[PDB]
Design a protein around this ligand. Structure first.
Ligand code: BLG
Ligand code: ZN
Ligand code: ZN
Length: 277
């Protein structure tokens, strides 16, 4: 690994190059049929990544910065693509919510509060920090192995541990690829690896990625609880829809629960701070 400071990080031309700089899993990848299968899916469903990237442009700078600070694999900045298509309103059949697809119980473990009007799993900053912590902890639990960490993120640490124990007793290898996991978990890791290979060298697959500037999109500003999204949008001449996309924790755009804080476009943050005083 290497590190870059705040100063150096500014010099990347776009977010894709910045993300690629911190990839940590590429050298470990081999020719697996499981990876190829997932790579084919991305090529034959090209609108998927394009739509994910357009939505993700709101959030990717923040995610990348958090990953860099913790020296975690920047391939994880693509995990919300796989999990939610970078749609923080996505809700799975298991009730997994937000960019990072926390189920209620795991959300509660990380103190992501769920009321009738606020879901901290959808909250961009809270859910991101919780997801990275969970992934780091899982990685540490499986002796530094990011593949097993990812598998446990999807299937639970118990499932993965039991699969390891089961293979050990049979005298079989205990690496991710050899574990008899649920099919969703079997596909999970190769999906991320496949996607990361395309992001690393998109030309080689006949793909073009939407350029995304290497700049912050939003800034947090304090807002007291008696102020709705519409009023904030009016005050700073913001698009209310974009503001909702930046603050998806608030169900029906109701801001009565949760933190006294909104993410707002960087360019308006100073004015809003001053006007709310
Ligand atoms: C981040 C998160 O909440 N991860 C949890 C994961 O969610 C998974 C579930 C999956 C999901 O929603 N699957 C259904 C998809 S579909 O609706 O059928 O398409 N997506 C989430 C993140 O990968 O499910 C397992 C098992 O329950 C949990 O482990 S356990 O608590 O030890 O059991 C684990 O904590
Ligand atoms: Zn270091
Ligand atoms: Zn570098």
């Amino acid at each position: 690994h290497h590190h870059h400071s705040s100063g150096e990080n500014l010099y990347f031309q776009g977010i894709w190059d910045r993300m690629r700089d911190g990839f940590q899993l590429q050298d470990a990848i081999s020719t697996n049929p499981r990876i190829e299968r997932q790579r084919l899916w991305f090529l034959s469903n090209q609108s998927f990544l394009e739509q994910s990237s357009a939505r993700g442009s709101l959030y990717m700078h923040y995610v990348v910065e958090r990953l860099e600070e913790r020296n975690m694999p920047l391939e994880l900045a693509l995990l919300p693509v796989i999990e939610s298509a970078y749609n923080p309103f996505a809700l799975s059949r298991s009730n997994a919510a937000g960019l990072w697809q926390f189920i209620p119980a795991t959300g509660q473990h990380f103190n992501l509060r769920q009321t009738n009007f606020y879901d901290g799993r959808r909250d961009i900053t809270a859910s991101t920090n919780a997801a990275l912590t969970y992934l780091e902890r899982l990685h540490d639990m499986f002796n530094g192995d990011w593949m097993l960490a990812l598998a446990a993120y999807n299937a639970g640490e118990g499932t993965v541990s039991r699969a390891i124990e089961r293979n050990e007793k049979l005298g079989l290898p205990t690496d991710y690829w050899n574990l008899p996991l649920p099919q969703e978990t079997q596909d999970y890791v190769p999906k991320l690896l496949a996607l990361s290979q395309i992001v690393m060298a998109p030309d080689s697959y006949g793909i073009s990625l939407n350029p995304i500037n290497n700049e912050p999109y939003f800034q947090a500003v304090r807002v007291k609880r008696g102020i709705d999204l519409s009023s904030v949008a009016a005050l700073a001449n913001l698009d209310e829809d974009e503001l909702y996309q930046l603050n998806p924790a608030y169900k029906r755009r109701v801001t009565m629960d949760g933190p006294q804080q909104l993410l707002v476009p960087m360019e308006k943050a100073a004015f809003l701070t001053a006007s709310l005083d």
